[PDB]
Design a binder for this molecule. Structure first.
Ligand SMILES: *[C@@H]1O[C@H](CO)[C@@H](O)[C@H](O)[C@H]1NC(C)=O
Lengths: 29, 380, 365, 49
């Protein structure tokens, strides 16, 4: 279990993409 | 003086020779001289082995030697059992003791060659991908770009060069998630490092005596004792470990120093049962580890021939000596004067190499900077 | 019965009978009625095991006078008195062995090797401020310090194509933590180079704290007391009048004390407590600071509750290593037989079984 | 400013002009430290079992 799993970072890029989408959505305005 | 075999006679019986013998027991005997009014000579045993009534049967070495009549008092570290008890008498033991097992002490051997591993290499790359992409995405979200890489690069790295700030509102909100990402990332790194630094080093992999790897022998672990020792008596009277007992006959010895150097050369993994000597061996060698639970509670005392007129007297002195603490004085004299590090199997690291890797990364980035800098020089 | 070798003195009144394990141990009575309770424990079990070795029959006659032997006008009273008055020629139970006892009665070969210790262990502690220059980051530590120092020359070489003290202070403070501001670059050259250095910086901290917490995980904190040879126990008031180290009045050790340490004998005679439970309560009280006694009893008390704040001197290093067991009146010779028996017992690890039956505990171990 | 401070100081901006705010928000950063001081502590802890 020394090296972490790429899958064992889900929420990381979850929130990443979420922020990116919210960014584009608001920047429409 | 000490009349003993010249070459110790382990096969080539060179004749005797006066040597010098001296130690704790010698002190004891001289005390018993000053208190018992006798004179004497001193000699070694013929074999270099205690003895046992092996097959008619007969006792090897010192036992049969005393039993003959050519000897009249046997003083040495001597165990006690029933067999020897059947023929001779001996007073109360002067040093209680038991059994234990010694193994070549291992080195702490820190493991930080994970200097970039403990998350992944895949992660180590996808993070740079993410930083580049979110950087340029924030740029497009603006409409301060050629250097905007500095922005996210540092905010991951906590640099503080901050030549500017996002003027648009979009990125001026966006950056928060990037900050939190950096925070949680370094947190993660710290946490997994701390966890990966819990993997203990199991040294006394044998639990007392019930460890099956030593209750049923594995070729991965080597082990023995000294032949014809009382320890063999203890085993063969306790038929359970007979196999291991039988097994250990594939490796037995004739001398203690044999197994001593054997575990010293890291081939033999464990020596046994001379506990009251394993203590000095350890506290004067500090490359060995004792362990186990005390097996066979017994004691070293002095044996004499059958029903000699001396028995009743000897005991007396001993207790007299155990009264005035003179025993403990001899202890402090010959015992406590050995010491090495004894805290525990301590966890620590000063690994020049695991950080020398990243220092080499430093030096490499240096020449990379020279090259890229003059590249930009020719560019501009 | 005084301790976990003979303890039992309880009688079952439900059936007028006693459990299978125990054995009738009728005190005389005080016409001595010869019905006391039935007893059990450790030495009793030794005797039971012995029974299967030599054919004989018990008489668990109890004691009526005194706790142990004393030469009242050179006249042995106690258990030794009972054996010297030819009233009974075999006596067992926790009975120390010395020269003085041997003078008349003989002894078997003891089995439970015993000694003198003390137990006062309420105190505690933590690790001294001794691991922050800890084995983590000392040599590589200064190595990184100087490998940092050297970057200044490259900084100069870059700047040539106003900085020196500035650059030094900057990167130094950066290593630990960014606190103070200063215009680091002017031109994207240095803006990259020293940048990667901060990278290193992070991992530096990332390592350091990680081990520090790690290194504060193990906790021994060995106690700090005075052995049986310190003036704290040799000359109390001459060293420090705050010294309350007691013992048992009529005990066996009294011979040793009143024969070799009359100083501490008189200095502690004003603390001769009574019993054992009273001693435990007083040691949990603070009224008596500490006290000294035989080994086995205290090793057992280690398995009590307050013992996890009351343990040994911190060693098996005792005074006048000893032991005890059966004893008989220089006559029967059955010693010989029982000798091997006891050794036969040893030849089997039965002592381990018995110890499991009686002599392990908790808040110790 | 204060948002980024909570996690980690990265980007610059002229926080005060006059020693009033120069004290108030200051104590907030105090809290910030302990925040991180707590968080990582348990996280490693929670990755133990
Ligand atoms: C440490 O010893 C002191 C001294 O009596 C005591 O008050 C305290 O409760 C002890 N604490 C621990 C954790 O041992």
């Amino acid at each position: 279990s020394s090296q972490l799993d790429i899958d064992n970072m889900a929420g990381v890029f979850y929130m990443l993409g979420a922020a990116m989408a919210l960014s584009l959505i608001t920047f429409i305005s | 003086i000490c009349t003993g075999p010249n070459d110790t006679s382990p096969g080539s019986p060179r004749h005797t020779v006066p040597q010098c013998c001296y130690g704790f027991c010698i002190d004891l005997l001289i005390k018993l001289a000053r208190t018992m009014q006798f004179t004497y000579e001193v000699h070694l045993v013929a074999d270099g082995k205690f003895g046992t009534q092996e097959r008619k049967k007969e006792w090897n070495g010192m036992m049969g030697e005393l039993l003959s009549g050519q000897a009249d008092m046997i003083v040495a570290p001597l165990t006690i059992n029933n067999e020897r008890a059947q023929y001779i008498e001996f007073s109360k033991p002067f040093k209680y003791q038991g059994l234990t097992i010694l193994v070549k002490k291992e080195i702490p051997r820190s493991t930080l060659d994970s200097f970039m591993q403990p998350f992944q290499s895949t992660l180590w790359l996808l993070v740079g991908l993410s930083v580049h992409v979110v950087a340029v995405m924030l740029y497009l979200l603006d409409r301060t770009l050629s250097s905007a890489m500095w922005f996210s690069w540092g905010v991951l790295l906590n640099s503080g060069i901050g030549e500017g700030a996002p003027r648009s509102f979009s990125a001026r909100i966006l950056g928060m998630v990037w900050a939190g990402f950096a925070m949680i990332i370094v947190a993660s790194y710290t946490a997994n490092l701390a966890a990966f630094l819990v993997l203990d080093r199991p040294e006394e992999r044998i639990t007392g005596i019930n460890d099956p790897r030593l209750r049923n022998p594995s070729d991965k672990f080597i082990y023995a004792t000294v032949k014809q020792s009382s320890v063999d008596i203890y085993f063969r009277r306790q038929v359970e470990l007979s196999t291991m007992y039988r097994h250990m006959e594939k490796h037995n010895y004739e001398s203690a120093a044999e197994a001593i150097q054997a575990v010293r050369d890291n081939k033999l993994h464990a020596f046994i049962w001379d506990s009251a000597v394993l203590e000095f061996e350890a506290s004067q060698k500090c490359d060995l580890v004792t362990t186990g639970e005390l097996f066979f509670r017994s004691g070293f005392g002095i044996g004499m021939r059958k029903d000699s007129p001396w028995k009743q007297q000897v005991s007396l002195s001993i207790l007299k000596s155990h009264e005035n603490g003179f025993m403990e004085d001899l202890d402090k004299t010959w015992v406590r004067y050995q010491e090495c590090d004894s805290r525990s199997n301590a966890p620590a690291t000063l690994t020049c190499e695991n950080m020398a890797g990243v220092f080499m990364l430093v030096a490499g980035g240096i020449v990379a900077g020279i090259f890229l800098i003059f590249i930009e020089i020719a560019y501009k | 019965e005084e301790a976990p070798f003979v303890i039992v003195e309880s009688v079952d009144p439900l059936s007028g009978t006693c459990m299978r394990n125990t054995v009738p141990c009728q005190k005389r009575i005080i016409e001595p009625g010869y019905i006391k309770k039935c007893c059990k424990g450790f030495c009793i079990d030794i005797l039971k095991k012995i029974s299967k070795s030599v054919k004989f029959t018990y008489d668990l006659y109890l004691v009526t006078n005194g706790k142990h032997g004393k030469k009242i006008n050179g006249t042995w009273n106690g258990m030794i008195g009972e054996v010297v008055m030819k009233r009974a020629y075999m006596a067992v139970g926790s009975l120390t062995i010395n020269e003085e006892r041997s003078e008349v009665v003989d002894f078997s070969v003891p089995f439970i090797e015993t000694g003198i210790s003390v137990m006062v262990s309420r105190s505690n502690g933590t690790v001294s401020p001794s691991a922050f220059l800890e084995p983590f980051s000392a040599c590589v530590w200064v190595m990184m310090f100087v490998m940092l120092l050297i970057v200044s020359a490259v900084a100069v070489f870059v700047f040539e194509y106003f900085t020196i003290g500035k650059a030094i202070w900057l990167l130094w403070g950066l290593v630990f933590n960014n606190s103070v501001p200063v215009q680091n670059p002017k031109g994207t050259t240095s803006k990259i180079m020293v940048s990667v250095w901060a990278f290193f910086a992070v991992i530096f901290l990332a390592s350091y704290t990680a081990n520090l917490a790690a290194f504060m995980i193990q906790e021994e904190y060995v106690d700090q007391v005075s052995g049986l040879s310190d003036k704290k126990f040799q000359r109390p008031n001459d060293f420090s009048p705050p010294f309350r180290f007691g013992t048992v009045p009529n005990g066996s050790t009294e011979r040793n004390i009143r024969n070799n340490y009359a100083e501490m004998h008189a200095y502690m005679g004003k603390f001769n407590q009574r019993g054992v439970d009273d001693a435990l309560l007083s040691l949990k009280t603070g009224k008596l600071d500490a006290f000294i006694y035989d080994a086995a009893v205290l090793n057992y008390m280690a398995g009590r509750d307050e013992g996890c704040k009351l343990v040994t001197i911190g060693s098996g290093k005792v005074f006048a290593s000893t032991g005890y067991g059966i004893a008989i009146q220089k006559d029967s010779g059955w010693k010989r037989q029982v000798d091997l028996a006891i050794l036969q017992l040893f030849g089997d690890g039965e002592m381990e079984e018995l110890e499991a039956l009686w002599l392990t505990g908790i808040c110790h171990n």
